[PDB]
Write a protein that binds this ligand. Sequence first.
Ligand code: ZMP
Lengths: 255, 85, 80, 77, 60, 73, 98, 38, 494, 37, 170
Amino acid sequence: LGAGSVIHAVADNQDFRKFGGLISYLPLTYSVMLIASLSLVAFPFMTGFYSKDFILESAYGQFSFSGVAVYIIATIGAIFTTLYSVKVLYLTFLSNPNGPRTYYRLAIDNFFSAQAIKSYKPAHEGDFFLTLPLVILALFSIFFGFITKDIFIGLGSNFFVDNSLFIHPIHEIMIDTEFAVPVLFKLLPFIFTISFSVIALTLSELLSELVIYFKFSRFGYNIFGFFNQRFLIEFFYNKYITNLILNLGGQITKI
Amino acid sequence: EGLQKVEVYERIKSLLAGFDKVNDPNNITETAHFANDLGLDSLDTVEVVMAIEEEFSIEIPDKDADQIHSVDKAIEYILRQPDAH
Amino acid sequence: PKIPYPKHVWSPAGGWYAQPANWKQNTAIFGLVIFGITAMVWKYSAEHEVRHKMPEPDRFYPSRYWVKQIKDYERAQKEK
Amino acid sequence: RRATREEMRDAKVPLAYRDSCAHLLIPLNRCRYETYYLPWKCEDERHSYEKCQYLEFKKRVQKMEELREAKGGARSN
Amino acid sequence: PNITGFDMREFLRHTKTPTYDPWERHEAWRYTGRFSRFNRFKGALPGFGIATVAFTAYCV
Amino acid sequence: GLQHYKIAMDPALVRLGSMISNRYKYFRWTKRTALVSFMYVVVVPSTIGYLAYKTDGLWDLRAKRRGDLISER
Amino acid sequence: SNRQAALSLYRRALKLALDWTVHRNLWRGQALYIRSLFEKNRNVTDPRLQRALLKETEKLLEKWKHPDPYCPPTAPGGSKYERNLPVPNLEPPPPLKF
Amino acid sequence: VVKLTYPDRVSYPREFEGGLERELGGAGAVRAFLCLDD
Amino acid sequence: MSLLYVLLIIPIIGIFLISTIDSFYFFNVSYYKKIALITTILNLIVSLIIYILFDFSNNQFQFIQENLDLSFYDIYLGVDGVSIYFVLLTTIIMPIALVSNWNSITNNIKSYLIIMLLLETLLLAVFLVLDVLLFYIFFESILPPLFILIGLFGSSNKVRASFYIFLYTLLGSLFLLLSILTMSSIVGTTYFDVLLKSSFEYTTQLFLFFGIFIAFAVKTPVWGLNSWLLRAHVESPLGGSIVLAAIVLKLSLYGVFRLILPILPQASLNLTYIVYAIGAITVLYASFSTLRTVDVKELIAYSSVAHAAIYLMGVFSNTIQGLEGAILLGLAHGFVSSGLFICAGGILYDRTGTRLIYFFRGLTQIMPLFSLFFFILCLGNAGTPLTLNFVGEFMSLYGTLERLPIAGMLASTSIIFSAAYSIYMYNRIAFGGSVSLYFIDCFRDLTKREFFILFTLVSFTVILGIYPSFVLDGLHYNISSVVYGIEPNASYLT
Amino acid sequence: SRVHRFLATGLGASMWFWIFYRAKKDGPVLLGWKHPW
Amino acid sequence: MYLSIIILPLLGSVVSGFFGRKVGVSGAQLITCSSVIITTILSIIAFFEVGFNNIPVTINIFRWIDSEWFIINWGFQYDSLTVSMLIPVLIISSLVHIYSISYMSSDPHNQRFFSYLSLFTFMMIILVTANNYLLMFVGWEGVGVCSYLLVSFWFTRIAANQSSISAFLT
Ligand SMILES: *P(=O)(O)OCC(C)(C)[C@H](O)C(=O)NCCC(=O)NCCSC(=O)CCCCCCCCCCCCC
C-alpha cells in the first residue's frame, strides 16, 4: 500500500532507476514504509520481531542437524532480506532524484510565465481514502506483535485447546527455544541486521563505486543477470515444460 | 488538460538552455534548426534526443529519431503523442 | 482525461464510467435487501448454532441475546 | 504438589505440557482466561511457572554431564 | 584487443563526476539544497529526535 | 443461409485454414512418421497398459491401520 | 547506409550504460568516454572496415546487454502499455437479425 | 560444512510420568518418552 | 396408456401437425417452429410428471404396460433409476436445441423440424426400451435422420462429415449386433429381467465384451476412433450438434449400464487395464490436440472426447462412487457442451461466418453478456467447483483411482489439462486485446434468445452443482445393482 | 496540507519511543544480563 | 451471526457486479465496503468468542454430496484457528477496499473491480470456515478464479493475460 501511493505520485512508474528523493514530497509515505520494513527485517521489539525472529531460535531450538543447517540458510536469507529492504527505501526515498523534472518541480520556484496554473504536478501524496489504511496498519505494525505474543506464542498458552493445532510432545522445542539456545544466537540476527544494512548505506551515497566495479567484472556480470532473471527457472519452465506440451499437441494433431 | 503549445515550448527551452556547446541561448526560436541556427553537429543531435525523451518520460524510436532535427518539429511531434506526462 | 467508448454496449456491471442520477435511492433499495436477508441468515444461523461448552455468565458474550442453544439453557439454569 | 491426571486432565492443558511440572501451569492458564491474555497483568505467576521449568531444565542438562561422558563426548543425536 | 578502442580499465576509470562537462547546468538542480546529502538525511528518522526528548522526561 | 457481419478476411489466414483442413490428404509413410505413429499409438499405450496390469489389485488404503500394509499382493 | 545505423548504436550505447548504473552522475561521466570514443573514428570513410566496425560494436552491445532495460510505462515493455484500450470501432452495429 | 561442525543436543528428551499412554489414544498409538533408551 | 408411450408419441403428433397445416391454412414458416417448440415442451412436462411420481428405492422397472400380445419383436418400455435422468436430460435439451436454430435455419424448415422431432422420439426410446435388441434397434435408427440432417443444413464439408458419422456408427454397431445376437441365442430372449439373471461362461464374456466394447469405443469416442466426431460435430447445424454432443454421446455410457456391467461381470473385471489404458491415453491425447485446435467449434467438440474418457473410466471402476459420478459427469457435460457450441457455433459463427480463432480477440469490450456466460461455461468445462461438472469429475476420478491408482492418477492430469485449453480459449476470444481488427463492423451482444438458452444451461450446471442431491438421490438404489463383488464379513448372511 | 507532516512525524514519534520504553524493561532480558524474573 | 459473516461479502459482490449498473460507481463502493466492514466487525467478535472463551461453533446448512460413505456438507466450523485466520483477511480486505476508492477513481470499470475484491473476500471465508477438505476446495478454487479475474483485470494487457494464465494454470 505504501508502494501503491508511490506509484500514484509518479506517472505510474515502477522502476527504481528513475526513483529518488521524494523525502519532502512523500513524508507520510516514507514514514510508514520504514515502519513496515523494520518489522519486515525483524527489528527488535516490533510486530515482525517476535514473529519472524522466534523462528530462528525455534529452528535452532530443535537441536538436530537439519535445524542448525537451516538456521544458517534462514540467516543468510535474512541478510539478503535487509539488503533489498534498504534498497527500496534508499532508491525511492534516500537518494538523489533519478526521474524527470515533473516529479519534483514544486511551485516554490516560479520557473514558469504563462503555465503557472498547470504543469507542476510535483508528486503529491494521496487523499484521505488512500492514507487512512496506511495509518491504521502503521499502528498494527508497531504494537500488534507485542500485544498478542502471549495469545499465540506464550509459553504454556491454552488458546489452542479444542485440538485446532495439534502438537506432539515427542518433538516439543518450545522450552529449548527460550533456554538452551545460547544468547549470541538469540541476538545474532539483530547483529546482522544493524551491521549488513550500514554496508549498503556505505556502498551507496557514500562510495557508490564498489557496486559498479563488481557489476562489470565478468564474474560479477553473470551473477547479476542470473539472479535478476529468477535463476532462469521460467526459462527452464517455458522451453522444457509448456513448449513441450505445445509441441506434443502439435505432433498429435498433425502426424 | 493535456500538454499545450506553451507547455512544451518553454519546458523544452530550459533543457537546451543549459548547453555550453550551443552558440548562445538567444539564438533559439520556434523554428531553430539544430544545425543551421544554433551550433550543434551530427552527433550532438541524438544526445539532445536522449535528453528530450528522458525528461519527457517517453521513447523516441530510431525511425522517428531522424526526422527530428529542429525544435519546431519537436513541438509538433510531442503533441502528436498523448503519452506525454 | 476520459477514454472514448461505445454507447451501445449494455453491461450488467454498468459500462465504462457508469453512474445513474438515482445512485442513492437505488443504493438504498438494494441496501434494504442485503439487510433483509442478512438477519434472515442471522435468524437461521442463530437457530442452528450448536455448541457444547457453555460460557460463564460474567464473561462478555454478544451472542447471549439472540442464539437459542444457550438462551434456553440460561433460563433452564435459572431454576433452583 | 504434583498434579494427578484426574484433576489435571480437567484443566485441559496441551499435550506437550502434561509433565509433572505443570502444577503451576493450571493457575497460569486461569489468569490469561481472566484478562484476555494481556501480557502485563499476569506477570507475577508467569515468572512463577518459569521457575519450575527453569529448575527442571538445569537438572536435565546437568544429567548430560555423566551421560555424554559415558560415551566419551561422542554424538548423542 | 579490438578494432575499436575499448579498454575495460579505461572504461571503468572514467566512472566519476567529470571536471568538465556540457551538462551540469541541466543537472545542477539535483545537487542543490533541495536534494543535498545533508538535507536528504534530515528526515531519515522522522520522529527519532522528538521521541528521545520525551523518553528522557519519562526517565526523570 | 443468413448474412453475417462484415469481416476483414485475411487470405493468409484464410489459406492457413485450408491447409489445416486439408492436411489429411498429403500424409505419407516415412522413417520418421511411422516412428511417431508407432510411439504414440502403440508403445505409449502399451506402457500404460503394462503398468496397469502389473499393479492391479496391488494396493488398497481402505482402513489399513498402523502396523498393516497398503499392499495386498 | 552506414550513417543512419551508426547513430543508432550511439543512441543505445549511452542508454545501455545508464540502465546498468542507477546513479547517473556516474553515467554522466560515462558518456564522455563513450562520446570521445566515437570522436576518435571521425573521418573513417572506406566501407570495408566501416561496416566491420559497426558489426564489431554490435557484438559488445549484446555482450553488455542489460537483463532488463528501462522502459517508460506507456511503451512497449512498459507497465501501462495497452492498459485501458478504447474499442477500435466506435460506430454502432448495423441493423441485422441475429 | 554444517554437518561436520554443528553442536550436539543440550537438553535431555522430556520425561513424562506414565508415558501419556491413555491421553495419546491408548497403546495403539505413538507414545511419549518414559525411561526408554537414548 | 403408459406415460412412457406418451413420451414417444407427442413428437409424432408434432410431425403430423407440422406436415398438414399447409393443407389447412402459404403458411408462414414461423408457425411450424411454434408447433415444434411447443411439442418439445409437452414432452418436458410429461417427463417432469414422471419424475414427480418416480420412486427412488424400487428395483422393479416402473411405468410399464401390460401387453399380453407377444410377437417376435415387441416394444417394452420401462423407467428405473439409471435411465430416468437420461430421459430427463433429453426432454430438457430438445427445446433449447430448436431455439438455438430459431433464425439460423432458413431453407427446409419443415425438414429440419421434422428430423429433430423424429430424432427426439428415437432418442427417448433408447433409454426406455426394456431389452437389448430394442436398445440396438433405436441406437442405430438415429443414423438416417442424422445423415440427412447434416448434409441438408451443414457447413461446407458436410458431405464428408455425414459419411463419417454414418459409416463409423454402422461398423461399431455391427460388432455390437453380433454380440447381442449371441446373447439372445444363449438366453433365448433379450428382455432385461430375463437376460440379467443369466450368467455366461468366462470365454463367452470375453468375446461378448469385445464387439460391445468395439461398439462403445467408437461411440464414446475414444481417441484414435474420434475423427467422425470432429467432422460431424462441427459441420452439423447447431441444433444437431447440441443433440449429438448432449444426447447421442450419452447413449453409449448408458449402454454400459445395460449391456456390459450386469451381464459381463467377470469380463469387465479382467479387462479394465485395457480400458484404462485407452481411457488415459484418450484423456492425455485429446487434451494436447485440443490445445492446438484452431477451429473454435472443433476445440469444443474435441474436449468432449477428453471428458467422455473420464466418465468412461468411472463406469468401469466397479465403485458406487465412480458409477454415480459418471452419470453426473455425462449429465453435466450435456449442459456445458450444449452451451459452448451455442457460444462458438451459434454466437460467433452467426456473426462472423468463420470459426477460425485467428479472427477473434477481445470480445469482452463489445459483448459483456456473452463474455460472462462464456466464462462460466469455460469454468464448467474445466470442472471448477459449484458446477455439476466438477462433482461428476471428482466422483469419477475417485472411483477410477480407487479401482486402478496409476490409471486414475493419469486421468487426474485432466484437472491440469482441461483448464489449460478451456482458459486458453477464453483468453484468446474474450480477452487478449481490445477487439480483433478483422472486424470491419461492430458486433451486437447477446440477443434475448441467446441470453436465455445460455442462462438455462448454466443454471442447470450450477444448481445441481450446489445441490447434486437432486440427481444423486434417485440414482443410489438402482446403481447399487450394477456393482460386482462381496465383503468377507457381509456376504452370505444366514 | 501540513496535516500530512504531522501524521508522518506523529507515527514516527509513536515509533522510536516504543523501542527505548520497551528496551528499558525487556532489554536486559534478551541480552542474558538478567533473567526474566 | 456466524453464518452471516459468510453471506455478506457475497451479497455486496453480486449487487456490485450484476447490478453495478443500478447502484453506480459510488454505490458499488459503499455497498461492498460496508459489507466488508460489517463482516470485519463481526469477525473480531468471533475472535473474542471462539478463542478467548474457547467455544467452537458448528453450522451445517445442508448436504453437498451424499454417496454411500461420502456425506460432504455445506457446513462451517469456527475454532481457534479460523477466527485467527479471519482477522488479517478481514482487516486488510476492508482497508484495501478503502484504498481502492482513492486508487481507481480514474479506472472506468470501477464497479466490476469492487465486486471481485468482495468476491475474493467471500471465498477466503469459505476456505477457512469449512468443516471438511472438499468445501475448503471451493474457497481454494474460488480464490484462484478470483485471482485470474483480477490479474487480467486490464485484459487488453497481453502481459496480464499471460500472467493470469500462469496464476490460474500453476
Ligand atoms: P555525425 O556524428 O552524426 O556523423 C557520423 C558519421 C557520419 C561521421 C559516422 O559516425 C561515420 O561514418 N563514422 C565512421 C564509422 C562509424 O560509424 N564510426 C562511429 C564509431 S564506431 C566505434 O567506434 C565502435 C564502438 C562505438 C561505441 C560502442 C559503445 C557501446 C556501449 C559500451 C558500454 C557497454 C556497457 C555499459
